[PDB]
Amino acid sequence: SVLYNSASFSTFKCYGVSPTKLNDLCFTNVYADSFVIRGDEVRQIAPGQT
Amino acid sequence: ERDISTEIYQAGSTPCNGVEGFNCYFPLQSYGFQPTNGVGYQPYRVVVLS
């Protein structure tokens, strides 16, 4: 929640789970998939694209 | 209660209305249903008698 209103990222969105609800919500496991792509390929990484 | 407010949903990082930045979508959207859709997407003239 401290990185949402930081205004230091180009694209900071959350699908399914609201970004204003992860401040006190428990999670079983959290994964991190770091990768570098192009500029127009950011919209491709979304639940419901091809 | 009737609400016809045409403001901006203020709940993201950058404060909306005062400035325009990020997470400031338009609340009043436009539907757009078409005859080639499913059964659950067809409109229904709901009439409530109070």
The residue of chain A with its CA nearest to that of B23 is: A13
Give dist(CA A9, CA A7) in Å, integer. Answer: 6
* DSSP string for chain A: -TTTTT---S----SSS-TTSTTS---S----------STTTTTSSTT--
Chain A contact present for B48, CB below 8 A: no
**Close Cβ partners of A7 (under 8 Å, ≥ 6 residues apart):** B13, B14, B21, B22
Question: What's the resolution in A?
Answer: 4.3
**B23 neighbors B12 (Cβ within 8 angstroms):** yes
Backbone phi, psi, residue B46, to 5°? -80, 125
**Which residue in B42, B17, B47 sits closest to B31, CA to CA?**
B42
Which A residues 11-30 touch B at CB under 8 Å?
12, 20
DSSP secondary structure, B9-49, as one string: ---SSS-TTTS--SS---SS------TTS-STTS-------
CA distance A1 to chain B (A): 10
Elucidation method: cryo-EM
